[PDB]
Symmetry: D3
Amino acid sequence: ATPHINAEMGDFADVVLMPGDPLRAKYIAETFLEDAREVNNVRGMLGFTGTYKGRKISVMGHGMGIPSCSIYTKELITDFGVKKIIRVGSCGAVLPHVKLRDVVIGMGACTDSKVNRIRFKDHDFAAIADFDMVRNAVDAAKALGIDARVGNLFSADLFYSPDGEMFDVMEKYGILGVEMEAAGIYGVAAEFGAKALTICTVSDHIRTHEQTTAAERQTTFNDMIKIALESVLLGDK
Amino acid sequence: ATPHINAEMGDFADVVLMPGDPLRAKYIAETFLEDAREVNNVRGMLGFTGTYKGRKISVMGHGMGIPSCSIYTKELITDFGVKKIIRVGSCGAVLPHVKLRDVVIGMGACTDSKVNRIRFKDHDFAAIADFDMVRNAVDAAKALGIDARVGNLFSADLFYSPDGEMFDVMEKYGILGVEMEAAGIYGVAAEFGAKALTICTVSDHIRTHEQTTAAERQTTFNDMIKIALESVLLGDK
Amino acid sequence: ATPHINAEMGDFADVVLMPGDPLRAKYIAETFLEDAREVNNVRGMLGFTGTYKGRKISVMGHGMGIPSCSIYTKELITDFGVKKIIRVGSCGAVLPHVKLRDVVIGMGACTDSKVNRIRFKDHDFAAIADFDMVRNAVDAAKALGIDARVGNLFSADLFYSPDGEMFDVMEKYGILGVEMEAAGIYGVAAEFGAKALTICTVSDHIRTHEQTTAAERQTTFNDMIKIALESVLLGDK
Amino acid sequence: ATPHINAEMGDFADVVLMPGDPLRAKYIAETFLEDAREVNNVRGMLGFTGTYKGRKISVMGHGMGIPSCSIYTKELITDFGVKKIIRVGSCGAVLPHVKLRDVVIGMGACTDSKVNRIRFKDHDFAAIADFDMVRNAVDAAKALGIDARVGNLFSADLFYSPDGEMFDVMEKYGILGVEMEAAGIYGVAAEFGAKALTICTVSDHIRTHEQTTAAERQTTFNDMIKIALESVLLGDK
Amino acid sequence: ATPHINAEMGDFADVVLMPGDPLRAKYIAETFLEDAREVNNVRGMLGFTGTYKGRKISVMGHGMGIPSCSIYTKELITDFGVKKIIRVGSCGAVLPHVKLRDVVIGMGACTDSKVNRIRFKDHDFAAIADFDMVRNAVDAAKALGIDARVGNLFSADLFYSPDGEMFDVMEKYGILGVEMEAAGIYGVAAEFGAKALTICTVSDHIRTHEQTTAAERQTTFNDMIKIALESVLLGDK
Amino acid sequence: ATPHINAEMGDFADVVLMPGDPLRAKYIAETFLEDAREVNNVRGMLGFTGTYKGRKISVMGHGMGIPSCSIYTKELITDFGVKKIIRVGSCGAVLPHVKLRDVVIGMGACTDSKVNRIRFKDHDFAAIADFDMVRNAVDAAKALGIDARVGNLFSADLFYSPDGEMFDVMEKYGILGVEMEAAGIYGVAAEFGAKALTICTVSDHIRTHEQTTAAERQTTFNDMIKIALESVLLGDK
Ligand SMILES: Nc1ncnc2c([C@@H]3O[C@H](CO)[C@@H](O)[C@H]3O)n[nH]c12
Ligand SMILES: Nc1ncnc2c([C@@H]3O[C@H](CO)[C@@H](O)[C@H]3O)n[nH]c12
Ligand SMILES: Nc1ncnc2c([C@@H]3O[C@H](CO)[C@@H](O)[C@H]3O)n[nH]c12
Ligand SMILES: Nc1ncnc2c([C@@H]3O[C@H](CO)[C@@H](O)[C@H]3O)n[nH]c12
Ligand SMILES: Nc1ncnc2c([C@@H]3O[C@H](CO)[C@@H](O)[C@H]3O)n[nH]c12
Ligand SMILES: Nc1ncnc2c([C@@H]3O[C@H](CO)[C@@H](O)[C@H]3O)n[nH]c12
């Protein structure tokens, strides 16, 4: 057990999918895994372990923001033998050509957090995913006939930015989606010698009016989960 | 409703107690409030409203870290008429004389987050509690015969900090507790025009490594809750 | 003697009032203290010791700016047994409702100086007053029937700031007065293990350009001095 | 023509290989390209355009360091229609398992330069390559029987850094190679909406301080160029 | 009149010598000027105007530190027609070959203050003297047979540095003297279009044991004043 | 030999002129030096050593930007006994009174590079020339009937800066010319205990965007080289 996870070694698979919402973790386990059992409930941050096509898989919420997800990913890696984290989240779009429901794979993650500067002697650490995990996700998406854009996410500390001006900058520099965790998770993975990937679906456009349905949004969210799970099978190789 | 809170104007009292742990919010509502009703379940971030000695009061979790609590506190203030936030949590001590279960009142909160620099043109914003709220908590503690220290907290972005030597600096500058939220809540209070206070119970010692269990950091921090609730009554008069 | 103070241990009371203007220190000693003797003349930074209602008290100028007051406050603390510093000056208001001659009590002090970053590993140190001293000043003011606001000061390095737009940010974050010393004194107090408080009288309005003369900012700020002196008596009990 | 390139729109292919040693351009043109013509000679920075297996390719040196390569890459993109830049150089290794002559592909590039902070409002821009270009290079290398490592480079402003300890930090965070340009080229690519990749051969160990032959050096350089050129063909499909 | 100077236009010469100590200003006026009259006494910051060899000259203390001297130099320049400021101060040595009583001319001034970054969009402003003033001082020193070293000063915000480690850095980079004002004065001169120079005599060695007499120190201080005054005559040309 | 210079101790004179355009080295050697011999050719950065009026002088290009020139200048100083470096280039003017073909002498160099902050513990290092070298150049120019302006250069990392507004700030603070190397060379000179000077001819107006001929360009270049060479002779006495 750790301060934030009341589970024992072996309770987690060596791969963990992580949405921000713990209720979403339960959703994923019930929807996609067989024989899933709850393995954590401390602070309501539900975690589960089951199988996907015979492969042992865990899923657990990471909460909102770099500081929250940094706690859980660190403990999973150092205390629970976890080798890969796949964050499966939502993000906001800033580019006109990135649409609601687009699947976005964060090969890198920009941030306005100070956590990586603290790690990296106040220089610029390029917070990046594991290349093979990125490749596995791209390939799984292709096999599923799902379009996926690979590029930079922006991990924001403030969902409610006092700025606003930063959005034009993100767009100019080609950021695919704004979320709150990827850069933190990538920093943890680098710090502790594990591998991580963030995939998101665009749930909002931080600057426009697009129309979709709940059934379609939920379908795409599930496609993201299928991509993540299938990407694991490809990596297992 | 707001993006992270499924409730309507009036569902919350104008004062909200907020532990980081939504399960602690549940404990508080069951233990200290009368006629408590659950008013939010989104993301499992439980929130309740009831009365304490006839005074309407809410309690809701804020999650771990500045980015998480910044979302909830902002939404409460801008959309739910909330005027005062009292954070009630846990912190780790760095001073030798500070002991487990000690109550600390954060008149100020240091931080290694960038959020206040982003608000304050990269200068030093002194993240401070509302003075009357501090005095109210001090007086309530005195009436309850509970010892409480008033001074600076340190709101860390990384629970697992790579910079161990920073604790020596915190100790040197007399930091009473290390937690992860106060500076962000104080920043939100100033930005959105409300008032806030953080009270913490020392749950672990960063030097001695002595600590309390998760179950204890959920259902046994009663002194702090009593001080918080009684301080509201003082504030009303 | 210390490098900037030609006096000996015991020449100063354990509490020192410090205006920025050494001529104001002279005024205070002549007006409010009994049996005042001059104890320092170095650099014309006049310092006196006498009694107020039988209580031994000193008053000495600290000069303008963080670097100046940091010298004097450090030397008093490390070599003259001084336990409490009460800065008594002047500030400019940015809030519309704050008026000339208003008394403000700086529970916190924001700053654009680098001195606290240099102390605090480039993180945000919340430069805060001693809580008991704040409460003492509030109570003394109430007993004197003098209105006083408690909150953040902003300690500027440049009286003539090239960044006019920063005043809008100060106003936005509810800064009560702009002065040039509090954050530095609070930093010294924490570094060298003493206690401090800054009380200011609003001497000018940064927006309206209304202001008081030099002669007025030397010999007519009596409310603040009375509050300061009476707050010491409260602290003793 | 542009300030540093005396050529006209159309003189460059849409893909440009760029070595850091300007003498390498003529070498690549003569050894790998057919029907090459000279298209720039300003400041001795020879540029050539030719074909590789029918496909139009240009090659021109970029000079050492971020500021030099930022000039040439910007001009190529904005004034010469260049869509893809492949930097082909040399790097020093800090990781024990990374050895001389290893091929490294910079999916990301860390840096101690300020250029991306200047671009990105002082936040962390994750300077990244184009994913497809990265995968093309990985695949091209594999087809050539060369195993390539993919991860972060570190783009240093000072070849002679006074900060010895930074190398240990780079090692801790899994930096594959130290060079001086990638983060700058990636910043320009994002700023001006093009695609870039840096491929490096390990020429030295930062610690071990060994190496490296000139023949083995020439063979490995040829391998890198072949990888780069074949990667373009894969990119075309 | 200005907020810190109770004098009228024309009361100051177009050149002002400025020691930090207002009593030293009086010393200089009485010792070196004919018919000197006091023209400011606000806050005890004595200023005088008289003649040196028929040339109109003013001298006035600037107080300790960048924020203090920035006020006075700004007002002198914008409100009193002052064209040149010559700071005449003391400094501490860090280099083994710089000796007590050496005369140091600050062609540049390093600093740990944030004031120039605030002016200069957070980049590095090289705080420099006016070249002709430097040349005039060098020439006047030569005519007087006085040795003078020209190089960098370091203007510190904290006379009592918590660091200490910064002194080895200053020495490595060849800093000639540590004082507290030059960089601030040079920033003001640049901001407001005037000319400035700092000359110091080494009054202490921040790291050694040297022996001199009071008569010798006072002699050298006067030599610095002669250099400053004679340099003015040379500039008048 | 060093990593970037294939030569041995003694191959370079103690004084080296360095243009930014490498083709200029052979030009200077053939046009101004007698009995010149080639001493470096690595990476095409030709270096020559010869005499000017009997005095040994070397000349070698430095490449564009701080990182490139920092490599060559460091190696020259630490491994080739070089005592003085004179950079001879080109700069853009932002001041209206500074015109094309004007000679500018950088007594100081501002910068947006991070290299000196990295050297100087994140404080402001005033990157300065050697005073005697500055005065020699001023005197050499005057003897040639050329009026030279002495003041600050600005050494930019990005020739193509996304920050348009910085040019107005440079103008406000009296920057004489914008180039890309001086602050870096001055930083290296201070780090390794040598002496440096940058002299530039104004080749463009940043705003006006005019210029500049090639003949008038060649004449002015010759004038700069003559100033540089004659300045060395003055330096020798
Ligand atoms: N426009 C946006 N900005 C920031 N975060 C998010 C998200 C994700 O949802 C959460 C915030 O609602 C957080 O976990 C973040 O990763 N969706 N859309 C977002
Ligand atoms: N030693 C410690 N360091 C940081 N945060 C905390 C806490 C609080 O508990 C949570 C992390 O366990 C988070 O909300 C923080 O504010 N308790 N002990 C802590
Ligand atoms: N508008 C203003 N801005 C900055 N400081 C001050 C002050 C105080 O007075 C001094 C400057 O006049 C200095 O000590 C500062 O703390 N009064 N009004 C001020
Ligand atoms: N250990 C090292 N550090 C920095 N750069 C390099 C290089 C490359 O070589 C050049 C400097 O020698 C520059 O272009 C850089 O990218 N090889 N080995 C390097
Ligand atoms: N070692 C030292 N450090 C900082 N300042 C000074 C001085 C000058 O004296 C004052 C501090 O005593 C201040 O005005 C500064 O410029 N002398 N020696 C110094
Ligand atoms: N407006 C300008 N901006 C930056 N650099 C330069 C130069 C010099 O020319 C090179 C860039 O063209 C580089 O060496 C720089 O120092 N001339 N005009 C310039």
